[PDB]
Amino acid sequence: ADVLTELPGVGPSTADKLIEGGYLDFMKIATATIGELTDIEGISEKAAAKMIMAARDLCDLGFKSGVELLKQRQSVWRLSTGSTELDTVLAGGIESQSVTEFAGMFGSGKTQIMHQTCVNLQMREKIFADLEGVVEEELEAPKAVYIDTEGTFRPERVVQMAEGAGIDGQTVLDNTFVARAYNSDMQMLFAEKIEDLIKGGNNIKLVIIDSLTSTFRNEFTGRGKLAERQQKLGRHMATLNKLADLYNCIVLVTNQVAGHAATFRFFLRKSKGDKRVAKLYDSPHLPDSEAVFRITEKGIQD
Ligand SMILES: Nc1ncnc2c1ncn2[C@@H]1O[C@H](COP(=O)(O)OP(=O)(O)NP(=O)(O)O)[C@@H](O)[C@H]1O
Ligand SMILES: [Mg+2]
Ligand SMILES: [Mg+2]
């Protein structure tokens, strides 16, 4: 919560050094390590360790039980994919505070789904949030971040899907940030820079990395230095998982295939005609199931 001066032991000066260093929220200080904190101007370990321990207090990061376990879960909001069967398989839609992956072969529809989610994010009938754990002012003016890795982002497809949904295409475009990444370094940097958008008043609620693995697969072709690949990709994933937890946003990624973390995993396959099949083969509380949907001029439906 923006007002760092409330942090016992933290004055206006210290606080200044903080907001600069990237800490503007209590949670980010509470979940920080003495290292990443002392790496700032004049912040000693005693001062670093103390505020850190104090931020945890403010946020009440302790042991929870009984009904309190159900409260933490109500903070997770979901987004509709546009498909009824798909949302039912996700028990609502795509979850915030998690990374969900859509893997599949060429033309299976991974990119189409990413575009649709930017459109649905701008319609509150598409957003399913529990009011007991998500105050609507937190969902106000939601913005998306689309890190394009192959250059497949299509402004016209979003406008078309927006028409199909019954809203203004230009509106979706105004509330969507697109960053073209030409390599793994750029992909990773863009993801670390999302914190800057939020510091700039932008309520980033949807982060898309399309695709998550093509650059890594391009820069580490030799299956000898396959360990350096997993290490770099491993850091990228922790950054993504952390920003989904900290800013209560959903993280969406695509993967082309013919291993890395992610809480929900789907296999997408072409079927007859405009039909498609999405199979959930991995999640912590949902069973493996399949969903049939279509891709059309309107976008994703059924
Ligand atoms: N405007 C549109 N109207 C109807 N169908 C469309 C439209 N745009 C794209 N499609 C369909 O979407 C399919 C391709 O979707 P796409 O999301 O790009 O696949 P993909 O998973 O991203 N594969 P890849 O690009 O190799 O990573 C096409 O082959 C079209 O049939
Ligand atoms: Mg999470
Ligand atoms: Mg694609």
Residue numbers in the entry: 2 to 259, 279 to 322
Which statements did the authors publish about this structure?
The bacterial RecA, archaeal RadA and eukaryal Rad51 and DMC1 proteins, which belong to a recombinase superfamily, facilitate a central DNA strand-exchange process between a single-stranded DNA (ssDNA) and a homologous double-stranded DNA (dsDNA) in homologous recombination. Archaeal RadAs are close homologues of eukaryal Rad51s (∼40% sequence identity). The structures of EcRecA1 in complex with a series of DNA molecules have shed light on the exact mechanism of homologous DNA-strand exchange. These right-handed helical recombinase assemblies are classic allosteric systems equipped with two functional sites: one located at the subunit interface for binding and hydrolyzing ATP and the other near the filament axis for binding DNA and promoting strand exchange. The series of crystal structures of M. maripaludis RadA presented here further suggest the conservation of an allosteric switch in the ATPase centre which controls the conformational status of DNA-interacting loops.
The second set of MmRadA–AMPPNP structures were determined using crystals in the presence of 0.1–0.4 M NaCl or RbCl or 0.1–0.3 M KCl or NH4Cl. These conditions were selected because they did not appear to provide adequate cationic stabilization to trap the protein in its ATPase-active conformation. Indeed, less ordered structures that were essentially identical to each other were observed. There was no electron density for 19 residues from Ala260 to Val278. In these structures, no plausible ions were seen even for Rb+, which is an electron-rich anomalous scatterer. As such, the catalyzing effect of the monovalent cations seen in the ATPase-active conformation is lost in this second set of MmRadA structures. Compared with the ATPase-active filaments of MmRadA, the filament pitch is slightly longer (108.5 Å). Since very similar filament pitches were observed for multiple data sets under similar ionic conditions (within 0.2 Å), the difference in helical pitches appeared to be significant. ATP hydrolysis would almost certainly lead to the collapse of this stabilizing bridge and result in mobility in loop 2 and hence lower affinity for DNA. Such structural consequences have been observed in the MvRadA–ADP complex, which is essentially similar to the inactive forms observed in the MvRadA–AMPPNP and MmRadA–AMPPNP complexes.
